[PDB]
Design an enzyme around this catalytic site. Sequence first.
Site: not given
Lengths: 188, 188
Positions: A105, A125
């Site tokens: 992420c 992400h």
Amino acid sequence: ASKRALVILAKGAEEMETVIPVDVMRRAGIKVTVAGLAGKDPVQCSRDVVICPDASLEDAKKEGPYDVVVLPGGNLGAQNLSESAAVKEILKEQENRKGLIAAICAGPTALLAHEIGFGSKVTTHPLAKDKMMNGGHYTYSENRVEKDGLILTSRGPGTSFEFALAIVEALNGKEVAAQVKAPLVLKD
Amino acid sequence: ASKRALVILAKGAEEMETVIPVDVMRRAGIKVTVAGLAGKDPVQCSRDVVICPDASLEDAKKEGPYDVVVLPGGNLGAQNLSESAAVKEILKEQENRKGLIAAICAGPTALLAHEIGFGSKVTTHPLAKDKMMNGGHYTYSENRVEKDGLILTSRGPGTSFEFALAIVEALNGKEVAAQVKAPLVLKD
């Protein structure tokens, strides 16, 4: 003969991206140490889940080496990881001994801060892409899990299971990952 | 105007089935209380993740009512939930006021122990089916998420996201669930 994993836990970390890999890796028989960046005290994660680490990062550092170093995401957690000199030392050492580095992420942005793995293909992400790509030091991928050499990255909380199973496959092989996967009732 | 969720956390609970719904529900703006069955002290989950609850179950009981009561899985966690009289009182009260009851994996077996929702269609982890079906008081489903009236059940750690989003949809509606879902990078 037991593989060892280090999970670095800082305030603001995404608790789902912390607990899923820890849980899945212990299902695979990996010895996991959840090390608190700031000490042994409980860590308030991004959504206010409070987790007690197994050890301070200072103590866990002395009990290496680790077969994988895991960096959870969470915007504020990743910023804390990016500012820590102790994390820089751990990652540079891990890179030199050609150990695995895993980040998910926003976690991969800590690699840029510490100049780790330049030239590797990485994912993040979607909201962390611009930060990761500042300077063009990596090549960006939109795959849910990306592994280039010793750098393993993943995109978000919803990729945490695939991210965790990729670590198991890298450490313990494909058969163990498949055995650990079946009781989880994953879709694909 | 804020919905309230109660998550009952007992030793041996599956930490992934505890953290994912808590995290996802707080992303949806739901006020979540993670209540320790045995008190305020930290709870050692099934894979040795230690979580600090927000409150004891005794205290959280007094601050009801809750729009949803959530029972995580984990074999030993579910057994502790099944033996607790305080849990029986909370569930019976919730059933009488027609509030939502959510349980995942081995969690639904606590409903049988406390005689909750007989006649409902329910799912469990495949390994918990025989225990859930003792006496034929429910009808079994193999759907990853099952909702029959006020009883919402799910199968395992890998269904935790769908389980959590089903709660959000039940409480806050379909649009909020979809908004909360997009940043997670789920596959389907």
